[PDB]
Design a protein around this ligand. Sequence first.
Ligand code: K3Z
Lengths: 627, 625, 627
Amino acid sequence: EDPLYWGIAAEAMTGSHLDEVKKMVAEYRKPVVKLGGETLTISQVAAISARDGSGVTVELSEAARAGVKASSDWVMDSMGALQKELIRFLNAGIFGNGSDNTLPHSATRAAMLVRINTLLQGYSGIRFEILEAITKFLNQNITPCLPLRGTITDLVPLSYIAGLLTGRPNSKAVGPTGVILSPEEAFKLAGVEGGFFELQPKEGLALVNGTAVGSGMASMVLFEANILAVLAEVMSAIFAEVMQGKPEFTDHLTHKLKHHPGQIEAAAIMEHILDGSAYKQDRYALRTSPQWLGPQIEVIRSSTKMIEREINSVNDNPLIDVSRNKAIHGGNFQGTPIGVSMDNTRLAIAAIGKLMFAQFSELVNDFYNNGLPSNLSGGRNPSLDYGFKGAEVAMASYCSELQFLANPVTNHVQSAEQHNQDVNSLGLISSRKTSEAVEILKLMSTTFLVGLCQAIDLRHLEENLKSTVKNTVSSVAKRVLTFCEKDLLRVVDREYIFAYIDDPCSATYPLMQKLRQTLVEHALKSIFQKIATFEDELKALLPKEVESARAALESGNPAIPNRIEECRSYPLYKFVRKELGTEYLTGEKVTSPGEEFEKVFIAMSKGEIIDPLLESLESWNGAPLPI
Amino acid sequence: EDPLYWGIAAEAMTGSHLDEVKKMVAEYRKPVVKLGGETLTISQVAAISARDGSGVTVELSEAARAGVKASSDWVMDSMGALQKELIRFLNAGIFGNGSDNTLPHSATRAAMLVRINTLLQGYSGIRFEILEAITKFLNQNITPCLPLRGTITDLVPLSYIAGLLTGRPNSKAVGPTGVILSPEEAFKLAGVEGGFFELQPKEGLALVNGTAVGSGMASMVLFEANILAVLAEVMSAIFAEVMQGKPEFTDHLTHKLKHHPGQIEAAAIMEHILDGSAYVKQDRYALRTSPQWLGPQIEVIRSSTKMIEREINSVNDNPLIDVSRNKAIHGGNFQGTPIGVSMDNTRLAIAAIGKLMFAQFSELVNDFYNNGLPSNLSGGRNPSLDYGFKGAEVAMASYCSELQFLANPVTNHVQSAEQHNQDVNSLGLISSRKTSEAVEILKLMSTTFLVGLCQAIDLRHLEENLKSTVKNTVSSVAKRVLCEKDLLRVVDREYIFAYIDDPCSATYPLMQKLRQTLVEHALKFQKIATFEDELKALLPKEVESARAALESGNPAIPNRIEECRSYPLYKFVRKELGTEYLTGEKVTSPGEEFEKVFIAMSKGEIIDPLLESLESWNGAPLPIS
Amino acid sequence: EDPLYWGIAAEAMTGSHLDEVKKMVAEYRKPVVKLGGETLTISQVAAISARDGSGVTVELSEAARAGVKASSDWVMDSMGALQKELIRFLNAGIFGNGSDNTLPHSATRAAMLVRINTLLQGYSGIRFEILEAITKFLNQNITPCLPLRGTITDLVPLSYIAGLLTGRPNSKAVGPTGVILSPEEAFKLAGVEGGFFELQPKEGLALVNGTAVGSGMASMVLFEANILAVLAEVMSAIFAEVMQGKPEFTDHLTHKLKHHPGQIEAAAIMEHILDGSAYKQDRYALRTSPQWLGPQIEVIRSSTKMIEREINSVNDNPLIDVSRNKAIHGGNFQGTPIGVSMDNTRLAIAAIGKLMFAQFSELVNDFYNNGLPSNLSGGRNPSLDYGFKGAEVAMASYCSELQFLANPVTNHVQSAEQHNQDVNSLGLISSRKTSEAVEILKLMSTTFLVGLCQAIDLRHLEENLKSTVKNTVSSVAKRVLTFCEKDLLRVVDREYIFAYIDDPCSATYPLMQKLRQTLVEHALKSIFQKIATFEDELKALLPKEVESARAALESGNPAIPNRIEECRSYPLYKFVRKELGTEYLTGEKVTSPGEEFEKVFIAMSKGEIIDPLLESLESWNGAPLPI
Ligand SMILES: COc1ccc(/C=C/C(=O)O)cc1
């Protein structure tokens, strides 16, 4: 039914993207990664790549040993300085001093995990003992030092894993605390039984022939990319809340009629956030965000399945086919799936960043943000509070560099190795630039998320102070003006609080101006003789009441509670504010926006945003609201 | 008659690029960098950016004190909390954990230096005392911690220099040994007296409104780029030396007739190396066209240098305080377009230089194109257990591909920023960062190529010695067993490394062309087998003894490189640094040898031997014929 | 003094960039191009490349014949099917059907001119007769058909010039009117004496070995680029006029203190426009335009000198050195100066386009354009006139594609021709993408220039109608209100005309609102009883007077004449409006913005914008105003 395996690949793209992320997070946090050569996922690669003391360990399935020993025994039967030479001349990378030219140790761990899983299928002719030794290195967090560059997708970097296994004099390894270790010391601390391995024929190739380094980092990258995409879907909805945008842009009819599944899910996710919210036309960063993100999600998801197939592949050469009693020469080391997927993912990451920059730009602009103060200024004095103006420039710098990284790597192939490798995938290089793009998207996600929480608090401030103004205006009108008191309060309804609240009784601001106009309108239809009195009484009472209401709110005793507390998006806000301690940014305090950004960005790097994010949708049935 | 200052700029681009590099190096090594707001060079920025204990210090010219105090007093006489707010909201950068999101402290020192120089002209309205404090931080190697990202070209990274000066609670500084310091501790170690500064009006803008970070690092990059450009020129000649290429490709007529000065100087530099080569006794484009290829790259790098050298002596403040007319001048000198343009153009030139190195390296290691050198430049007796630079060649392609990727520009990704008030911005520092990345990758290719050239040199030394050996014993077997004039001609023509691993191998040419040779003279046969039996019994012994003698340091014919003008770089790599001839019969790997050169290169130790290769050059091409 | 020729190259970068453009335009329009092998300029290449019947002809200097015959005679003395073979196998281009794969005929003419000038030096060993034959083809406008692609910088395209000279059966040529011609017909119509040439040794190489095609189109490109740069400098100043921006951004102190000569000239040019103008803080597209354009001009100018040296070079191989009696083998065919200069110019063209898009965006936005109507709407009814809204989207599409073309071509080199050409410059390809970028910049220049003229007329309308409102308001106040009449007119001074003029007496617009406020302010200090009367009289008179004033202006009889008539920028406006007939775009007429854009864009393609542009600066002394 499925001779070319199109069908089984299609079966993996069914279900919602969120569910995959939910499952992805679930198996990431499982305590044991069992390698059988067929079931490795990017979440398991990521979980192992972490050096945060999670406790995760790697186990090799004994069901695969028989196949591994068979191909190994086959090579010995068909038959050692050639293996020593292979590792020597491939040690051609450059470390220099420092870590700027060394592969990140978490990326080395990813490569080590993938390198094992791609050798368990049993077609590589390498001793199971070597696969067990690399597992000890992972479990005891003993990482060999690999060069950052030197591969076109990974003879050179992988040879530094073989160099540690064979006890090369130049081989170095890092301990759990950053200590430089010699090969002997590395073996002693990892518990590798016996001494250094004397590589048998084909064992050298089995270790260096393969795409594990590129595919390993691509797995780490795509794990973070799948989270950040969902985080982009939810933040677009939170963005629509504080922007008070028309929620019909999520209506399922609109998206159903495009058939794009990524767009339909994205709109359904946002609809679910807005459907449980207590809060010409809207601009594109808001109204078209489902159309904009849909394809990006479809790309990250499709790219995820490419890598997952790669990390469960046999990418060495030649293939030892015991069943047929012959070695098969091929080109499964050509890591084209890595370069293509990372180039496509990097562009999608940049498209996500562009939308976030566009949304952030709307949020901090009083021309577009529907009443919020310019720069999301939070202080009583807008002239001594410029809020996120500095962050807005940073967002432009983030986005600009993201669009530069969106360019591909795979269109720069060189005819290499005496033109024998006249085509090569550049996979790892692409994974490296896509990792850089994710980290910048994390910078943008940190800044954007803290701004939304600032806007949330400002909406909470708007409602409380708009009520205080109403009460004082009504109290003063009942005193003095006795249809005229009903129209006076409609003015307070229409005017944006943050257009006058820094000085409620300034004759140049719209409150006192439009209040007077309403009185003049009625006088023409003595209401004019009382204007002077009304403005005197209001000038004496309103400033005191506004200040009182703001202090009560700042003191935690608001007259009207923050509506976010009853929003489906509350967990993310609760996480930033309550759990992390991210504080309201105001020009009356010394705390700078960056200091608040550190908290979210650090936690986001520790994966602490996964739970509050998923909790915002945990009651979603995975379907749109009926139309 | 130079009202627009075109001519002053054109006068700067006269003389050779080399002389400019020699002056640039010599100034890098001066023990004192005196700032006057007008004479700052990239070499001075590079020398101060270094945190290597060189001892270089910074002095402020007292002549600029008056102008500085004038604009400072004018502002105060024109009249606080706004200066505290300015630095607060511009502290919008993210550091996280580690140093991945932190500006390298060397780049920070560069920014601090340029920041001082761009305020000494007297048009910024900032107290001289603050400039003196930053100078203490530099000379005491007390560096504030700046974020790597957050600017569109430097209100944000520059605000963290101001954050240190004002004693912000989140402000962090690092000591010479990497120890993190508080703003109070920094002032103590730095020697700054009086405590934190309470910024006066305009002083906040004076500190943060410059282009110092972008321009500061472009100076570091351009310093490295200027040197690597000359290194690429010299190595192209050494490449043409070990390749035995026709030196006719450096004939001045060819390059005189194109007029391009970069191509003329490049052709003339390689001509000087080849004209003084002891090997003196068509080619492919990586060799025959290298001057045409490198010429334009040096012109862009040299042009880009002058752009940045003007930027680091400019006044990028705003507003400018003009006391002579008693008013502030609002403009846009903070627009760092010269940084983004020069860095985009320079990165493309770096990529073109790297592309040439890759093509040359490829020719040098391919036995089809390297004129008798062994495939992969293998140095062992058993080529089946010595693949030489095959792994390095793969790394070169990886270095080259990522460089072509970085060759793309940054300045074509401008976003309409800050509520669309900054609807154009230069992105200079971002471009400086990517060009700096391209530079470090080119250092990887130069290290690998340079060590590869020394390998090729030792392989020509092995070839000549073993060519002489085979000739001799062939004449011995010829005189004793027997013709000779043709048999001896076979040895001179044939490539050593086509048969030397097994000279008398029937499948190899030496023990085949001699048969063909003897049979030819016979046809125009009974003495063949005896001569072969005599040669088979004697040639392995004589070859192994001469090869072992060369390995012990007492070869028959000495290495001709010692009598070449290119010897300084070989002596430095092979003798001074300890780099060793790579061979599969030992366990040392190519990387281990690359490490020695890359580290030395990262510390500037390649500069001296490089310029020494051209010390005797008069700066002009030798005459025609 | 100048052994490496750095000095003589530096001497060519002295003087103002404008002067070079002035000289450039001067020699472009000279009737004869005399080739001596040393003095060819891009303006002469451009003038010859034109097929517009300018009458320009090419003359070969007899001073060069001696050198040409010497090297030719030298080859014959040192010594023919090899020349026949060289041209045959290099005829490997593909034309297909149509012109999408054919080199533009003007680009072929550029290549032909450069190909001659690079063979007149006398080091190429080719018969002077052949150089004379190609000259006939140029003078009689007989152009061989060259393929668009097939060169990495030009064996293949140049071989189709040799194919015409040797009468190849596949060779085709185009006539002055587009007629396809065979080689025989081409010779007959051009007047080439004798039959087809039988190429002697080295003559085939002399024709195909060289960079003429890339350098030829680079010359055409840089001629237009030098004009468009000056046009960008002037339009930034005109932009500042209609924007009513602070002119101190051109103050020479600011730019003198950066030392950047391109910035100093750009600011001095703008200062000169504004210094003779009768017309939070300003934004960057305005205030930093000299900083932004300076480097772009320095790049185009420096790139110009690279190409001019290339078109006067000997780029064939081997070089026949008669003086030394030996042929010199080298690599002057490596067209690196072309690729580098075109890549750098393309980026600068994109930087110019980005600033223009930024400026256009400010101009059409009522939040930023300082009183002009949104979209530069010109009709009485803003709801039926959206002005340049459609053009603003087009500008974004222009700019976006320009930033894509800003990417380089020279970082995509392939190891070619059995890896003998392991490095190559890709010059022509780069020239082709830079030509595409210029044409898009022409689209942006057309649209932006017509918008400025729209804004000019709107400023003329603003002044006339603001005066009409003043007179009616004063006439009504003198009637009814008799310090109060002086404050009423100050309101008219402060309010932007186009914020209310479409309905001057709407109670929801700011005119009637802020007029009433001023009356109420005075009444509180009976002035209140007369408000109703004042608004009745104004409602009856003001609409009639506004309409009368607008018709008088539309009828050519404005009460106040258009201040542009006395501006140094008047020529460009006079050219667009008067000479070309570009009409005021108003939603009350059927004419669309594109129709007006055709006129300017067509004329700009015919070089008709050079004179009005230069006339705006013809009285500039080439120095900044004293500080
Ligand atoms: C991002 O925060 C900012 C933005 C703008 C400025 C002033 C700029 C000028 O003087 O033209 C200062 C700080």
